Inverse folding.
């Protein structure tokens, strides 16, 4: 695709879960078409945060499917994720997607891919999209050297701000959701 | 090279001259290193405006060769430009440069390239650099359909503003210079 | 070349200056030959810090050329750098080096490059090399949201630590130098 | 994919079997998302060791298929492995996987690939994945020249350590399983 | 070129210094033209061991050049090595060589490259050439995990045996030099 | 070069010589910087028409040189052309130019190139530039099937109009010179 | 394929319709196999003219599909074409053909393509194939500046004659068909 | 494929029909695997000569297919040839063949291709394969300029001799079929 | 695939039939995984020798398809080979294999490829695989110039030895099968 | 360059010498600018025939150099030709020319190239340029099989005609020179 | 260059020295221009045999440079070869030649390349050129397995014959020189 993924960051910190994302939709090398896209949402009656950085048709397809697996498996995030991955990597159309998916609940944080990966981080942080690695670095750092004086939302928010500031493909229209 | 040119816009409008530029310095595909670069300057005793979007050492090599060409052909901008163009494109190293130069005095506005082009626009507008074509589109549009209500500086600033809003390689730290 | 550049991070914070770097020397895609390289040094009687991530033969040529420039412009970092850049971009050989130089005295921080760039950052941080952008994201973030409880050297070290943890070309063998 | 395979090593030495593997999950050129993956498992009631460096949806599809072949051919490692190969290679999707499979019981050791290869080594060692070749050379050297003073598990862990030290894609978070 | 570098390994271990090398000279992808090439020599009245895996016309130009720098700087391996590198990286012809040089005296081991690298290993071992990395993994594995019962020349030899056994560009015709 | 040549057409018809050219200066694939460039001129006291489609620095260099050969050889177009070609193809800088030169006088029409060609057409028509082949086809046709009711200027003019109408790289700001 | 398309030109002028084409069949870069191919035909009882420059097997499939479409929409050229285009762009095989179709009845001229284009020209001329754009330039020109002394068939023939004379892939073996 | 087509020539001349072919089968760039291949056969009770220069599995599939179309359309070379082409170009596998088919009966000569070409030559001669063009030039030269003293089979043979003598992919093991 | 083919050589000499192959299984460019592979086997009850260097799952698909064709065609080797070729070349996956097949009985020796080639040699020798062309050159040379003093099995053995000596992809662990 | 070489043919037959050449000057893929070039000339007072398909500035530099060698070595065609080659190939500019030179006197016939080749044919014929290979095959066929009924000049003209008929880059405007 | 190297083979066997080469000069991919070229010569007064398949102007530059080194080093072949190599590899043009040199006297046989290689074989055989690797495999095979019954000159002759039989670039017009 000529559209660049947006940037999504997620973190669990002191009993709190947050997921932040910017809104920049770039087409081609350089042209911004939208500034405020919303690529982070709540699923399963506000019990789960989901972030998909690709197109909305692919986001909805994956959200619906993940919702159905969550019902079929009684809220078990890990199982629903593994089964989604299995389906995703065998689907002729969706498998080729570059954009990844982050799902999280109260207990755990997961990265799902179209090549069929399901990855649980070791420090409660995942990041994806064009800016994802910069936000990853900024959050990891904030949580380790400033964890005590910052929360999960202040962290998700700062990580994305740092990334907007260095990534040309990430902007400063930050959307932030938390689980309570 | 891995450093992107900043964006420069120039306009002659109703007797006034102005030049503007953003400050975004990007290295590689996506990484911003500086936000407030200055690449628009006054030369030749505040009588010309010059804009060069490439590196500093090339800026000084070119600006010095330009000064010398002016104090050689009696302040004639067209002739000094042409002769700088002749020497630029025959220099083993400098002629490979992608970055172009804009010089302007009270009377005329010129683009100079290291392949030896000297171009004087038909509509009082030149633009170069990563966003230069978006600034060119914005400024031409304002000058033709809203020129009666905007000054040369208003257009200069407004063109850069549009360019920054749509081009990932151009930001909102605008620097503007005017003659007189 | 096949040899990757090590990673170097520089920061001015609260009147203090620091510069860290790792020691991983990687050859080709994936083969580490050395873990404890020293690519950060003091110059001009311990008044400036210099980091160059390229080869030793190029580090010596550039550290000696900059030494000449410093004594020839009496300690003035900016004028030395600009003259270094002009020399570096004119040199048939050294002009092609991808690796860059960071120089800093107690007043200011500069990046110099073989293409002839000289860049002073806006927020007192520079970083270069393989893991540079991760270290730059980690450092910018800690300064904004944890500046009031971390010093220049603590930030330098944590930004290199963050970078080594996410970047395969950056290790944990950190060298840190400061000015008083 | 963009995800790099982890490193897996297997060895039969003096009647003992052992398999080691690291935890590094690298995405794209240089970015580590996970440090502690588990890609080495036990199957068939602790009679076989299986290593698969790939994604988990793929690793489960293969561990399931192989288990089904092992019970159909009554624990015969080679018969199950050959029939796995046939099926793997005639699968429109999984056939394309770069990630290979190592399987072993108390009697032998076999690499299996989506191209349909089934290879038994001549010297009791296989290794695969990003760092596989470095593990192989370490492992083989130790077996041949230090084999009276190291056991299978000692060698397995040492070959992976050696590989972790020289390969940027292999870390030091070593998981080791043996056949009791 | 179309000719592949042979393989060379060096190690310092319990006061002893050894350097081993194979003899396989391969032309193009796959044709072996010689099997007993000698690319390991003693220089400086049997006090230094030098190894260069590229062509003879280059290996002599470098050995002569290196030996002059030694007579000029009175046995100082490090100094001569750096001056070699300086000269080498500014030479129009020799700067482009892929093949690298290893020099070692009783006290130290050094890799020199035509891009101007001078690298002392942390662990007493260097290896270069087609099979260099395999020999590096082997020798490192031997020294760490079977160092108390193996000598420097015994390791040099073994690391090359392993390299030859797994790498198609490395044969079993080994040459071995040591310093007492 | 990123600049596209403009389009030039030339014709001798019933004792008349004309040369027409459009004014579109395109940079990159698609961006028009100027509409009215003048790339056809008179040399040698209005006795010769010259058309060069490249940059002005190259146009002037070539016009001056051609002027000097014309004086050195007493107006002989063919000889001055051949000597220019010889000089042009040996000059390290100019030889690589893509744009060609058309010169004509009362008696004859010539195409000169940087690879050293001098070509006299068979039907008194030459064309060059982005649109040149379309203008060539349009003129050839006009002169053969409508020669009697159209002159050299009406032909040069129509050929360029046809070409503006089908070539995206040629526009309708036509400049036309004739010899009397 | 290696086989080049012949050249076809179509024109409505003064109530008259004509369609010409050459017969050069070129294989590969430069080898002519045939000089007198017939790629222009009459259909639907001599009321329409069809030119297709591709292979005979594709000419028959498309001339028969268009025949079906014509009887199924009662002579209406535009509705037949649009339905042909939809069918052609859906077909797994024929959809990739570079060659295009020109159809014309006494009312109108259309171009149809495998990508599903249907284009009616603005000035009553179409052309396709190897020499198509030269024939299009020659024809457009003769109609504008010699329309009042040339008929539709005379223009068709002169445009193909002009094209053959400048295009290496177009010969002089012209076939012309008209409607009364 | 890696296998090169052999060479085949056909000619009709003074009521006689001949087809000649070499036997060289080359694999990759340069390795000859057979010298006496027979790719010229008689079909349809010795009434047609067919030649196909690709592989045997393809040459039989086409000869069978062609011979069925002949029994179905009662000896009509042209009709069967067109239906062959229609079928061939819609076949998922055979459509991709580079190699072409020549069929000729007493009255006519035809080239059929898998892109659906059916071409009758103007001058009684076809040639295909590696050396086809050289044989085509030779045979054409013989027929025109030495036709009154050479027979059809004498030309087929000579055109192949010449082809073999100048083309590395064509040898001198000639097979010759004729119809009375 | 990243697995190179072993080398296989067959010969019929003085009424004896022989086929040899080495055992080297190389992965990627240079890494040897196995040294004693068996790619030469006896089929159809000790009556045919078959060689296939690819993977064992393709070996068995092909060795089953081939038995099934021998029964269909009453042991007629050439017919079965031709029908194997037809089905191999139309198989969507197998069609793409680089590895070729050699089959042989008492009377004849064929090479079969998945592009549908079936080649019987003219001098009683075929060879395939990595080192095939070396083994071919050796055997043709021994057979022609030392034929009167070697047996079929001696030549097959000496050809593979020669190939292993020059080809980095061929080794010295030779398997030999004969037919009475 | 973008300009294609013209076709030149030379032949010695029964004591007569003759050289033919066409006139087509093609630029880029397909565009003919000239139909009647003259690239075949007489030198040295009508004792030698020279053909050079290239540009005229180059063809004159070579005809001049060769004439100077012919008078230095007293008409010795081979001595002059070899010394021409040496000089041609050591010329920083002309050495790169694809266009080759044919020269002949009453005794022999020689191709000379900027790579330094000097080739004498075995059968009295050379040909060069775009259509050279087709002329060669035509020429050779006629000489060998029709040589008692055609002279050198008859063959020369016939080989070029044949070449003009099959090659899109060669026309029928044949210039012929012979040694009286 | 578009001219392929002839094939050259040298051998020392039982105190006799021999060198053979074919005569095929091929231009581009496939066109044979000469069949009897002489690339094997006797030098230094009948004492050394020299083989070089490239052009005669390079042949003579090299054969002069080599004489000049033999005098300098008192007929010591290996020394002259080594000094030739050094100067060849630093020559800006000759450095780039693909053709290699074989020189040989009564005592020794060397291969020299313009990348500075000098190789003395271990089994008395070298070969270079298009068919070199085939000639090498043949000769190694005749020497080792039929050595006791062939002379040096017989092997050289039989090796080139074998190579010509399999390699499309090698022919059967063999030149043989010996030293007593
Ligand atoms: Na940004
Ligand atoms: Na922006
Ligand atoms: Na790391
Ligand atoms: Na590591
Ligand atoms: Na080996
Ligand atoms: Na236009
Ligand atoms: Na033409
Ligand atoms: Na041949
Ligand atoms: Na080998
Ligand atoms: Na032609
Ligand atoms: Na041959």
């Amino acid at each position: 695709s000529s559209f660049h993924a947006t940037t999504i960051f997620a973190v669990q910190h002191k009993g709190r879960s947050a997921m932040s994302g910017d809104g920049q939709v770039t087409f081609g090398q350089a042209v911004v078409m939208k500034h405020t896209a919303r690529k982070v949402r709540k699923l399963f009656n506000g019990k789960v945060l989901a972030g998909f950085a690709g197109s909305v048709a692919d986001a909805f397809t994956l959200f619906e499917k993940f919702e159905a697996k969550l019902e079929e498996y009684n809220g078990n995030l890990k199982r629903a994720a593994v089964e989604l991955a299995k389906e995703w990597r065998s689907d002729k159309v969706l498998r080729k997607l570059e954009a990844m998916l982050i799902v999280m609940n109260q207990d755990t944080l997961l990265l799902v891919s179209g090549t069929g990966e399901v990855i649980e981080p070791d420090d409660g942080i995942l990041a994806i999209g064009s800016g994802g690695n910069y936000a990853l670095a900024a959050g990891r750092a904030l949580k380790k050297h400033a964890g005590e004086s910052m929360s999960a939302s202040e962290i998700a928010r700062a990580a994305l701000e740092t990334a907007g500031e260095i990534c040309v493909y990430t902007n400063d229209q930050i959307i932030l959701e938390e689980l309570e």
